[PDB]
Design a binder for this molecule. Structure first.
Ligand SMILES: Cc1cc2nc3c(=O)[nH]c(=O)nc-3n(C[C@H](O)[C@H](O)[C@H](O)COP(=O)(O)OP(=O)(O)OC[C@H]3O[C@@H](n4cnc5c(N)ncnc54)[C@H](O)[C@@H]3O)c2cc1C
Ligand SMILES: Cc1nc2c(=O)[nH]c(=O)nc-2n(C[C@H](O)[C@H](O)[C@H](O)CO)c1C
Ligand code: SF4
Length: 508
């Protein structure tokens, strides 16, 4: 008869959050905290701080307008303890409560902490059911599988959700329409201009606080164009579905110099904090095919990324922590080159990717995978140091998605749990998929010398370094026989060049 305290964290900004469902407005209180612990665990991009705190304050006001009683603690409050647990206690001290109700969060370490808290009232923890597959459902699907393959989990999610399903058949007779026949942009095709969101009043206010109080943090705040509330988020989605979706998948893997968005949806920072719903997004993409406004190959490619990849990696994260975060399968011990932070390198592809991280707190998937992720693998950078960079630079960054993608798909530090094979590549891939190398001072045709592209000698040194480990999986066969036909004086030459590059780059 004292009511409940309902905690809401900065990535839980949904009216349908499980902790808010079943609220008694006359008795309960909602707790929302701007936490310097969370905001400095990594020194997150200036644009991530603005996004989350702008969204939080606006989410708080919408709650108040519905009759909710909201205890909102700002980062300028001088009694703010700084932490979620500290502010839980101080709130329970301020009035009587029957219990604390919360929704499981997206960081194993913080989830583990809150479950252990000694509190003077009971605490109920509810599954986050905004996701389409629960933690328990994933564990059940994975039980007894020797390896975990996304394609098979994706078929399960199509049947469970009914997306692109005509009865019990996949639409168009096939599950997947991905063709390995994709290419760079035509020279005359300029990519469209994307809708950016000018800052509303609340967002402007938080941008000034962040520019003064968090100046030591990575990235530029000028140009902030991310959506901070469901109306702004819905406008982004509308623009993607109407103008971009029909050409999605034609260009999902292309890269173009100083055009950082291309035809991608740019929804991840909003989806990851609750401003959009995964199911609603997919249903509006399906209806676009159903009504003749987009081709099926483009709509399936997009839906695959959300009910397939995004659900798959979260499942892996919760199934395999806390040990997943400690695996270093290739014994990588190198340091991270400084140009990851500064962008000061003559490799035009790396430089363009870091520039986008700095200026927009965003780069698109193939750059995260095949440029900065691939490079870190080949250089042999310690995965702890790669995780720290990815968690800093991107506006969408959370551990449950960053880890399996970075420590798994991009760098094989998990030994193939998420992907199935190292996604290693030489400069020839980047040249095929981009317009970068023509403007690069390096020569993508050469492997040795001071003008050679660093990806070429490094690729082969990586293959040579791990030839034996990679021999036992079986999807790496072409590169191994090609290494096998290499005379020894040819191998020694690239081993020497790759060694030279690691010193040059400040890795070892
Ligand atoms: C090394 C590395 C690190 C990454 N770190 C993150 C991260 O911190 N946070 C993050 O959300 N994604 C991460 N990604 C996945 C992907 O790069 C981003 O989701 C995507 O670039 C966001 O752009 P978008 O919204 O324009 O996506 P689109 O290209 O329009 O794709 C649509 C949606 O699919 C989802 N999605 C696509 N690919 C993935 C993926 N591999 N895993 C999860 N969801 C996916 C997102 O919800 C995305 O908004 C990472 C990928 C790699 C290789
Ligand atoms: C920058 C930031 N700030 C806050 C904050 O001030 N308060 C809060 O409750 N959460 C914040 N978050 C999100 C958490 O740190 C964390 O990553 C998610 O809640 C994962 O569930 C983030 C990422
Ligand atoms: S030559 Fe090498 S470093 Fe230069 S843009 Fe091409 S792949 Fe990148």
């Amino acid at each position: 008869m004292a009511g409940a305290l309902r905690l809401v964290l900065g990535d839980q900004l949904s009216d349908n959050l499980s902790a808010l469902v079943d609220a008694d407005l006359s008795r309960d209180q909602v707790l929302m905290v701007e936490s310097r612990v969370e905001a400095t665990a990594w020194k997150h991009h200036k644009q991530k701080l603005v996004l989350v705190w702008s969204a939080m304050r606006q989410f708080a006001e919408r709650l108040r307008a519905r009759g909710f009683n909201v205890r909102y603690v700002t980062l300028e409050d001088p009694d703010n303890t700084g932490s979620i647990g500290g502010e839980l206690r101080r709130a329970l001290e301020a009035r009587a409560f029957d219990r604390v109700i919360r929704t499981a969060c997206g960081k194993w370490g913080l989830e583990s902490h809150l479950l252990s808290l000694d509190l003077p009232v009971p605490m109920e923890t509810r599954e986050d059911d905004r996701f389409l597959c629960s933690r328990a459902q994933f564990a059940a699907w994975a039980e007894g599988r020797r390896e975990l393959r996304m394609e098979f989990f994706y078929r399960e999610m199509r049947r469970k959700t009914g997306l692109l399903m005509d009865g019990d058949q996949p639409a168009g007779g096939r599950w997947n329409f991905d063709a390995e026949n994709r290419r760079k942009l035509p020279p005359g095709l300029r990519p469209p201009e994307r809708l950016r969101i000018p800052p509303n009043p609340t967002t402007q206010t938080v941008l000034e606080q962040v520019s003064r109080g968090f100046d030591d943090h990575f990235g530029e705040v000028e140009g902030f164009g991310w959506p901070t509330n469901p109306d702004e988020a819905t406008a982004i989605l509308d623009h993607f579905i109407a103008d971009m979706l029909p050409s999605f998948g034609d260009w999902q893997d292309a890269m173009s110099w100083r055009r950082p968005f291309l035809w991608h949806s740019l929804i991840s920072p909003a989806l990851n904090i609750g401003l959009l719903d995964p199911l609603d997004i997919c249903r509006r993409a399906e209806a676009a095919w159903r009504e003749g406004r987009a081709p099926l190959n483009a709509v399936e490619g997009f839906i695959r990324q959300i009910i397939g990849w995004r659900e798959f990696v979260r499942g892996i994260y919760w199934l395999k922590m806390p040990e997943y975060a400690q695996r270093n399968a290739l014994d990588a011990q190198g340091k991270l080159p400084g140009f990851y932070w500064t962008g000061q390198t003559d490799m035009a592809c790396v430089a363009d990717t870091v520039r986008a991280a700095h200026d927009h707190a965003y780069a698109h998937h193939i750059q995260r995978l095949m440029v900065t992720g691939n490079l870190a693998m080949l250089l042999g950078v310690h995965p702890d140091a790669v995780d720290d960079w990815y968690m800093v630079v991107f506006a969408d960054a959370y551990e449950w998605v960053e880890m399996p993608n970075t420590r798994g798909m991009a760098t094989f530090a998990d030994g193939g749990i998420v992907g199935s094979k190292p996604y290693a590549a030489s400069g020839a891939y980047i040249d095929r998929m981009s317009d970068y190398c023509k403007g690069c001072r390096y020569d993508v045709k050469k492997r040795l010398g001071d003008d050679a592209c660093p990806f070429n000698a490094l690729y082969w040194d990586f293959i040579d370094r791990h030839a034996q480990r990679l021999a036992g999986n079986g999807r790496m066969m072409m590169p191994l026989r090609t290494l096998e036909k290499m005379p020894d004086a040819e191998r020694e030459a690239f081993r020497k060049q790759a060694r030279a590059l690691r010193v040059k780059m400040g890795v070892s």
